[PDB]
Amino acid sequence: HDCNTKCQTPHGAINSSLPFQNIHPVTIGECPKYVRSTKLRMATGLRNIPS
Amino acid sequence: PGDTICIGYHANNSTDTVDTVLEKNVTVTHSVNLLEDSHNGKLCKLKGIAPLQLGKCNIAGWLLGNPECDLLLTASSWSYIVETSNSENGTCYPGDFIDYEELREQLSS
Amino acid sequence: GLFGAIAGFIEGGWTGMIDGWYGYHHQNEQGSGYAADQKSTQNAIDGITNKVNSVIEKMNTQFTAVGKEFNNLERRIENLNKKVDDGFLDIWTYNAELLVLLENERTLDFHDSNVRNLYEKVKSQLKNNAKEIGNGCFEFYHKCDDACMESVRNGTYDYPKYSEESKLNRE
Amino acid sequence: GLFGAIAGFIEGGWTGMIDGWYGYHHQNEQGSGYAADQKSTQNAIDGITNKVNSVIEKMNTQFTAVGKEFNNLERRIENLNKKVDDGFLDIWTYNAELLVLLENERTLDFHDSNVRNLYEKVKSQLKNNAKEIGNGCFEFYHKCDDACMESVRNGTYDYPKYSEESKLNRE
Amino acid sequence: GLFGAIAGFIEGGWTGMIDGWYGYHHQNEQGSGYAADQKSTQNAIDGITNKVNSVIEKMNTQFTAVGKEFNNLERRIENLNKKVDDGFLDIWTYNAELLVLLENERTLDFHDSNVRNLYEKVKSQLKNNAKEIGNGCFEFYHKCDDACMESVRNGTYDYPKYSEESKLNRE
Ligand SMILES: *[C@@H]1O[C@H](CO)[C@@H](O)[C@H](O)[C@H]1NC(C)=O
Ligand SMILES: *[C@@H]1O[C@H](CO)[C@@H](O)[C@H](O)[C@H]1NC(C)=O
Ligand SMILES: *[C@@H]1O[C@H](CO)[C@@H](O)[C@H](O)[C@H]1NC(C)=O
Ligand SMILES: *[C@@H]1O[C@H](CO)[C@@H](O)[C@H](O)[C@H]1NC(C)=O
């Protein structure tokens, strides 16, 4: 389709400034590093204790 | 019944969870995802240049000008080359395409 | 936690404090309310933002990295390519998952530290003009109005001013 | 240590407490003995077990993976292979050694934190009904029998019940 | 800092203390001066030296590694070589930068911890023979000459000797 991207994979293009991705090891262009992780979430705030 | 001041910390309705070294499934008030798992399901341009679609032809079929690939005769510029699952037309006369993989790597340039 | 405060001697969090990560709840004749500590909160926000940004910033993007193709007389080099790609994948996946684990622990501990330091700061400001309950709260031995409370919050509480009155009421 | 307790103001450990990582030794009129603090010990065990398991778990197995062979006009690709294997060896050896170093430090520090926090927890229950010796021990200003001791250990100590008596012996 | 002492309740450092990382300033009738704590300073120096040495020590040197060359029909393997070299460069640069960031934070926090622990050491030696000012200072309720000060500096302070004078002056 006529879209623009920095990063293309065989499943579709990725548009992200994130360091890692789990979509595909094959990439063309300027992409995140491929890893096998299914989640990578950094805490910013604290333990949530509403109780 | 005297005046009071308390020291305390934030809570909210966030359901975000993170894993830590000592403990799994910790609910936290705020967090940021570092892992992209979403894509748009499309083939897009790179450097504002469209890819080349070989369609039912492959690179051999294209370059040699396999007669089924006549629709590719007008193709002129691209950011990357796309073969699809129906690209079956290449060398219609049987034999070997020498240094074909090298030529393919070169041609992407 | 490492510093013993969050989920520690201060048992739970405050859904009523919407304007900060850490802060104060007060009760007096004049009323009741929550207030964020701006200094510690802003320092923590800046620090943690710098941490996340610093993790992401160190990842120069993956520029073109493409699969190599191979003919039927190239199994060894195809396998070399697959070994390299798999090896790099093992390394980056292990490091990213483990790094996120470790950094999450450090972040939570950082918050615990900030809460402990705010509590001990108030404790050391007030000294014996108030009694520590133990649950993060202080009960004043003297009347402490809104201005006084604010003096506590901005670190200008005047201990000698209320010391005599406090000594009188404490006994 | 970072938190000052283990190998700190508490110079040494107790070979007589065989049933937990942390706990209490008491002496009173009914007799004398050790008892592990079950909660902190179990929390630490679970945490550390999770740490070790998380280190091991992140090494997705190496599926069948082998060395490559090369003919006499393939020295360059053989050397590429060797460069890859050696490079991976450098990365994994450095990372494993350094990771083990840093995590060992963290584990020891985690224990130090748990001891300090247990001590301050007891301290905050007892307040001035006991005097701090300084070596991790508290001396009561009131009689404290076995039930009382257990109340101290499980965080149900009744400060008001013994406050007047304590006040009597303290003065 | 994490432990609240350096850039914390002790607001600034001492350009007048030239002989150690941590220590004491005293003032009495006999005179005034700074003195480094040798034991804690040397322990910290040894620790940090071991950390730096351990970082450098884990990089067994890179023996000969030279660029490989390729002809015009070897572009794919040339690109494999480039992928390998770039992949290793990305990994080592990211790891070195991130490691230096994290370890620098840990080092600063380590210093903060050592100052806090030194402060609590003095506090626990002196007990109620002095009042905590709050800025890292203690005011004696008794006269404390050079020998007494030195007992504090070397961790041999005698609470009962000055206890009586202190109790008298405190009231
Ligand atoms: C959770 O609470 C916040 C604060 O009011 C609110 O903005 C948000 O809508 C809530 N969650 C929902 C219903 O999406
Ligand atoms: C802190 O609070 C008092 C009470 O009103 C106020 O007068 C004073 O200006 C404040 N101090 C600071 C930090 O500006
Ligand atoms: C703790 O011990 C006291 C004294 O025996 C007892 O009354 C109380 O029920 C105990 N609490 C718990 C947590 O079981
Ligand atoms: C501590 O100070 C006293 C008095 O100056 C001195 O006699 C003693 O040698 C010192 N003790 C230690 C352990 O250094």
Author numbering:
A (entry chain E): 275 to 325
B (entry chain E): 9 to 54, 54A, 55 to 83, 83A, 84 to 95, 95A, 96 to 114
C (entry chain F), D (entry chain D), E (entry chain B): 1 to 171
What text comes from the article?
In a previous study, we described five naturally occurring human mAbs that potently inhibit the 1918 H1N1 pandemic influenza virus. A greater understanding of the basis for such broadly cross-reactive antibodies may suggest novel vaccine or therapeutic approaches to influenza virus infection.
The crystal structure of the 1F1-SC1918 complex contains two complete HA trimers in the asymmetric unit. Each HA protomer (6 in all for the two trimers) is bound by a single copy of the 1F1 Fab in the expected stoichiometry of 3 Fabs per HA trimer. Of the 6 Fabs in the asymmetric unit, only two are fully ordered. In the remaining four copies, only the variable domains are well defined, as observed in other Fab and Ig-domain containing structures. Fab 1F1 binds an epitope at the apex of the HA spike, in the HA1 “head” region (overview). The 1F1 epitope contains several residues that typically contact the sialoglycan receptor, including 135, 153, 183, 190, 194, 222, and 225 (RBS with glycan, contact residues labeled). Many of these contacts are mediated by CDR-H3, which inserts its tip into the RBS. 1F1 also contacts a number of more variable residues outside the RBS, including 133A, 145, 156, 159, 186, 187, 189, 192, 193, 196, 227, and 228. In total, 1F1 binding to the HA buries a total of 1440 Å2 of protein surface at the interface.
